Enzyme design. Structure first.
Site, short mmCIF file in Angstrom:
data_model
loop_
_atom_site.label_atom_id
_atom_site.label_comp_id
_atom_site.label_asym_id
_atom_site.label_seq_id
_atom_site.Cartn_x
_atom_site.Cartn_y
_atom_site.Cartn_z
N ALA A 275 0.86 -1.08 -0.07
CA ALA A 275 -0.10 -0.11 -0.15
C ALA A 275 0.78 1.15 0.07
O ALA A 275 1.08 1.89 0.92
CB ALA A 275 -0.95 -0.08 1.31
N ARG B 64 0.25 4.46 -1.06
CA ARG B 64 -0.51 5.48 -0.42
C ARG B 64 -0.61 5.35 1.30
O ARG B 64 -0.47 6.49 1.50
CB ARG B 64 -2.05 5.38 -0.76
CG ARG B 64 -2.95 6.69 -0.34
CD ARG B 64 -4.32 6.30 -1.03
NE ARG B 64 -4.42 6.40 -2.44
CZ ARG B 64 -4.68 5.49 -3.19
NH1 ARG B 64 -5.19 4.08 -2.60
NH2 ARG B 64 -4.73 5.51 -4.52
N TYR B 65 -0.50 4.41 1.86
CA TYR B 65 -0.65 3.85 3.30
C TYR B 65 0.75 4.31 3.79
O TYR B 65 0.80 3.71 5.01
CB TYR B 65 -1.57 2.88 3.62
CG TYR B 65 -2.72 2.72 3.01
CD1 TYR B 65 -3.44 3.89 2.76
CD2 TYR B 65 -3.55 1.66 3.24
CE1 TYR B 65 -4.84 4.03 2.55
CE2 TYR B 65 -4.77 1.74 2.72
CZ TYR B 65 -5.34 2.75 2.56
OH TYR B 65 -6.83 2.70 1.95
N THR B 66 1.80 4.62 3.28
CA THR B 66 2.88 4.39 3.68
C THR B 66 3.50 5.32 4.42
O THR B 66 4.01 6.43 4.46
CB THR B 66 4.15 4.47 2.54
OG1 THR B 66 3.57 3.84 1.44
CG2 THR B 66 5.48 4.07 2.93
N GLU B 67 3.36 5.04 5.74
CA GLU B 67 3.20 5.85 7.01
C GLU B 67 4.10 5.37 7.97
O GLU B 67 3.99 4.04 8.38
CB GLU B 67 1.74 6.17 7.61
CG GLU B 67 1.08 6.90 6.80
CD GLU B 67 -0.41 7.49 7.15
OE1 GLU B 67 -0.66 6.92 8.10
OE2 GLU B 67 -1.10 8.08 6.31
#
Lengths: 481, 476, 128
Positions: C13, C15-18
Site C-alpha cells: 500500500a 498510499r498508506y506508507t506511514e
C-alpha cells in the site's frame, strides 16, 4: 457627537431609515410575501442551475457566492432563512432539501455551518422560469452592474398558503397557512364565476391549516378573520383517555398546535407537579418518538381525568389562542385585504404574465418569420439575384438593388446574402416553407389567444390541476364548532 | 547466457553513456538540456512576457521523464544559468545563481527564468516536420532525439565530461569567428589548419585567461589531444612606498578564488615569504580586483612563478575532445564538426522546402478548384436545383468538370458573398503568385548553392542581430 | 500500515506508507562533525553522498545479507548479539585466542523464529 443642524436631511434620512427597515425584513408582498433575501436565495439557486436532478452540494460556498454577487450584508439572517426554508416542519411546504444537523422541533437549532450540504425542492420549477420572460425590472449592485429582480412572479399563490413572519419592524402582521387543494377549488370557482359570495367559498374553504394537525373549535373567529384577518381562535391537541389492562387511564397526546415545544411544556408539567396545583398525575413519560410522536401522561384512579383535561386546556399552554394579523402591502404602501382581493391581484398578475410571455414569443416568431420571408423571397427570383451579385460591388449597391426589387430591410438582405449551396436542395426549400407556415400557424394561434382572455383562465386551471395531481394535498387538522 | 549478459552490458552501457555522457555531434546539446529547451518552447510563453518563478515547468519535465532525481534537472537549469561557466546564454533568469565562488542557491523554484533570445531562433521550424520524434515511456507525448540548429554550439559552449570511460574537455569559442569558419568551409572544401588559425585565432572564455602556447593549440585542433596554459592576468604597478603591486583580473578556468587564496595563506604560513601580508582581493562586483602587494626586498616575479608552481594561476588545462555520433564515440578534428553541421543544415533546409511544397501545392490544388468554379457558375446552380443531396451534387460536379472530393466540397462551401468577379481576379492573382513560388522552390531544389545562400542569409540575420568580440585576451 | 505477516502476501500500500524509524540508528551513526567519510556529488555534481556507513557496532554483521544473483552468490546468516559482544571483547582484551574457545563463547547461527539445530561439524566448517 452628532452636531447635525439641518433638520431637513435628518427627516429625509429618517424616512429612508423607516422605509428601508420596512423593505429589509419580512413584508406582505404582492407576489411572494417573502423577504428579499428569500428572493435572493431562489434567484441564485436558479441562475446557478443547481437542480435537485444533480447531486447534493456544500451550501455555505453557495451562500458566500450569493453574498458576493450581492451586497456585503450580514451572515446571520442569511443562514437563518437558509435553515428556515429547509425546515420541513415549520413551513408547510418544501423548498430546500438539507442533509445535515438541524434539531427536530424541540429548541435545539443545530447550526453546523461546516456541514451545510443541501439541494432544493422541485417546486421552484413551478415557481419561476423567467429566462426569456420579460417580466421584472432589475437593480444593479457592484459599481451598479449586475442584475437583481424586484419581485418574484409566479403562476401560483403558494406563498399565500405558506405563511409569513413580519412582525417587529413597524406594526405586526403574519400570514397563517391553509392547505392547497380546496384553495385551488375556490380560486377556480372565482375564475369561472367572478360574482360569488364569501360564505359560499367558506363552504369551499376549510379552516386555516397547520402542519402538525390541530383540533379547531368555533367558527365566529373564522367569520371575522376570513373577512378582516383579526382575532384569536382556540386550538386544542389531539388528546385521548385510554384504558390499560388494569383499568388505569392514560392521557395520550399526539401533537400540539403551532409554536409549541415538547420540552418547555414538559418542564412546565414538572412545575405543575411541584407547584402542587394539579393532582392525580403519576407518570410523565415519552419514548419511541421517532417512529411517531408519543407523549403520555398517566394518572391514578379516582381523579376525574376529563376534568384534568379541562384544566389542561384552561391553564396550560396546550391550549392555543392563535391570533391572526394580515395587514398587506401592495406596491410599498401598507394595506389590508380580504381573501377575494388577494386572488384578484393574483389574477391580474397572471394576466400580465401570460400576455408578456406571449408577446415575447410573438417577437420570436416575428423575427424568425422575417428571416424565412427573406429566405423565400430569395427562393423566388434566384438567378436574377445571381446576376445582381455578378454585377454589383458593395453592401450599399446590393442592399439598394434588393430593396428596389423586393422591398426588404438590410438585415433581411444580408441574411439572404448568407445562403450557401448546401441549403439549396428543394427538400430544404420546402422544409423552410413548411416551418414558415408552422410559425404562421403559431402566430395565428397566439393572435387568437389575444382575441379572448378566458383561454388564459383555462390553461391556468389545467396546470393547477396538473400541480394538484403531482402534489395531492390530504388534510391533517380537524375543525369543529 | 554469457552472450546475453554481454548484450545487457553493451546495451546498458550505451544507455548510461547516451544518457549522461557527451551529446551528439549534431547538436552538442545533452538530452536533459534538450528536453529543458523543448519543454520551455512548448511552454509557449514568450520571453517578452516577464519570466516565471515556478517549479511547474520542471514538474512537466519530470512528467515527461523520470530521472534518478529532478534536483539534477534543477542542477541542469542552474548550470545553464552559470554565465561565468557556460557562455552566452541559455537562461533568462532573475533568482540566486551566484558566481564561480562556492555559492549554494537552495531556493529552487524561487528563481525566475523562461525562454532566452538565442533559443528563439535557435529552435524554430518544429512546425515544418524537420526532425523525427519518438514516444516517451508514458505513451502519451513525443520528443525529438536531436534538434535543428542555427550554429554549432559544439564550439560555442565546450564540454566538461565525466570518466565513464574517460571525460572530455572542449573549449568555448566566438560567435562571429564561428560564422567566418562556416563561410570559409562553405566557400572552400580545400581549407587548411592555418585557415582555421585565421578564422579562429583561439578558444575563448566568459572570464578570460592567457594561453601562451602555439603547437599545443595546433595538436589540439588536429589530433584532438593536448594541454594548454591557462594563466591569470598579471599587472605590475608601483606602490607609492615602493612595492611591486600585482593586479590580477583573469584566472584559469574552473578556479575559485577562495581555496586558492587559502592555500596561498598556507604557503605563506609554512616557513616561507611571510612579509607579504597584503592580499586586497575584493570589490569584484565591478569586475575582478585580485590585488596583492609584494613585500620590500622581494621581487614580484619570483612569487608569480611560485604561484604558477602552485598550479592555480597557471594551469595545464588538458583536452580530450571526444564525441558521440552514429552510436559511436570519436576522436575529434575539424571538417567533422564542420561538415556534420553543414549536412545537418542541408537536411533541415531541404526538408523544410519539401514541406513548404506540400502546403503550397495543396493550396494550389484548392485554388485550381476555386478558379474552375468561378469560371462557370449559374449552370452549376441550376443543376444543383435539379438535385436534393450533396452526394447527388458531388456526382453532378464529377459529371460537370474534373475536381477532387475536397475541391467539390469546397466549391459547395460558397455563400452568396462568393458570387462576385473581383475576388475571381484576386484568387487568380494569388494562384499565379503561388505557382511562381512553387516554381521558385522547385528551381531552388535544382540548385545546390542556393541552400548555402540561405545558410548565409540566416548567418547574416543572426550577425546583424548579434555579435561578440574576444573578451579572452590571449597572447602567444 | 499493511504488510502481510509471513505468508506470501506482500501488501504494498504505497498510499498508506506511514512510518518512523527505530532507535538503533542513534547507535549506528552520528557523523555530523565527525570527519569520517568522503562524499560524491550528484545533480550537476553538487550534493554530498557518503561512501560507506561507519559505526561503532558490528550489528550488521549479525543482521544477515542477501547478495546472490549478481555474479557469484553469498549471504550473511545471522547470530544474536550478546555472546557476540562477549567473544568480541575477549578478542579485544586477548589478541591471541583460538577459534574453538570462542565457539565456546559463540552459539549457533541464530534465527528469529527459533530453530532446532542438530550437528556441529557444519558449525566447525562454516565458522572457519
Amino acid at each position: 457627537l452628532v452636531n447635525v443642524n439641518l433638520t431637513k436631511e435628518m427627516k429625509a434620512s429618517f424616512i429612508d431609515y423607516a422605509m428601508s427597515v420596512i423593505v429589509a425584513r419580512a413584508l406582505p408582498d404582492v407576489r411572494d410575501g417573502l423577504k428579499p433575501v428569500h428572493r435572493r436565495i431562489l434567484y441564485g439557486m436558479n441562475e446557478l442551475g443547481v437542480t435537485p436532478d444533480k447531486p447534493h452540494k456544500k451550501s455555505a460556498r453557495i451562500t458566500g457566492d450569493v453574498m458576493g454577487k450581492y451586497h456585503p450584508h450580514g451572515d446571520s439572517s442569511i443562514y437563518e432563512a437558509m435553515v428556515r426554508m429547509a425546515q420541513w416542519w415549520s413551513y408547510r411546504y418544501m423548498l430546500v432539501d438539507g442533509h445535515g444537523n438541524f434539531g427536530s422541533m424541540d429548541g435545539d437549532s443545530a447550526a453546523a455551518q461546516r456541514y451545510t450540504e443541501a439541494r432544493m425542492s422541485k417546486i421552484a420549477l413551478e415557481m419561476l422560469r423567467d429566462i426569456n420572460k420579460n417580466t421584472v425590472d432589475f437593480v444593479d449592485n457592484y459599481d451598479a452592474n449586475e442584475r437583481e429582480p424586484l419581485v418574484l412572479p409566479a403562476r401560483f399563490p403558494n406563498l399565500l398558503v405558506n405563511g409569513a413572519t413580519g412582525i417587529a419592524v413597524g406594526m405586526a402582521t403574519n400570514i397563517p397557512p391553509h392547505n392547497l387543494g380546496e384553495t385551488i377549488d375556490a380560486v377556480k370557482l372565482v375564475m369561472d364565476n367572478p360574482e360569488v359570495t364569501t360564505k359560499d367559498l367558506m363552504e369551499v374553504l376549510p379552516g386555516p391549516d397547520f402542519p402538525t394537525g390541530a383540533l379547531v373549535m368555533g367558527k365566529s373567529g373564522i367569520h371575522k378573520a376570513y373577512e378582516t384577518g383579526k382575532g384569536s381562535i382556540v386550538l386544542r391537541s389531539r388528546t385521548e383517555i385510554e384504558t390499560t389492562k388494569t383499568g388505569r387511564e392514560r392521557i395520550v397526546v399526539t401533537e400540539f398546535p403551532y409554536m409549541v415545544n415538547k420540552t418547555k411544556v414538559h418542564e412546565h408539567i414538572v412545575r405543575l407537579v411541584q407547584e402542587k396545583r394539579i393532582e392525580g398525575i403519576t407518570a410523565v413519560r415519552d419514548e419511541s418518538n421517532r417512529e411517531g410522536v408519543r407523549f403520555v401522561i398517566e394518572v391514578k384512579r379516582d381523579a376525574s381525568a376529563n376534568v384534568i383535561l379541562n384544566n389542561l386546556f384552561k391553564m396550560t399552554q396546550m391550549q392555543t389562542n392563535f391570533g391572526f394579523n394580515m395587514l398587506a402591502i401592495q406596491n410599498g404602501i401598507p394595506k389590508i385585504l380580504s381573501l377575494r382581493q388577494i386572488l384578484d391581484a393574483y389574477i391580474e398578475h397572471q394576466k400580465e404574465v401570460v400576455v408578456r410571455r406571449t408577446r415575447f414569443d410573438k417577437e420570436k416568431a416575428e423575427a424568425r418569420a422575417h428571416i424565412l420571408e427573406g429566405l423565400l423571397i430569395a427562393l423566388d427570383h434566384i438567378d436574377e439575384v445571381i446576376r445582381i451579385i455578378r454585377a454589383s460591388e458593395t453592401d450599399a449597391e446590393a442592399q439598394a438593388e434588393l430593396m428596389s426589387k423586393f422591398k426588404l430591410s438590410e438585415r433581411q438582405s444580408q441574411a439572404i446574402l448568407d445562403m450557401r449551396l448546401r441549403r439549396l436542395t428543394g427538400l430544404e426549400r420546402d422544409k423552410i416553407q413548411s416551418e414558415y407556415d408552422d410559425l404562421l400557424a403559431l402566430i395565428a394561434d397566439l393572435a387568437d389567444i389575444l382575441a379572448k382572455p378566458e383561454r388564459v383562465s383555462q390553461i391556468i386551471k389545467d396546470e393547477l390541476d396538473e400541480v394538484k395531481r403531482k402534489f395531492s394535498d390530504k388534510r391533517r387538522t380537524e375543525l369543529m364548532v
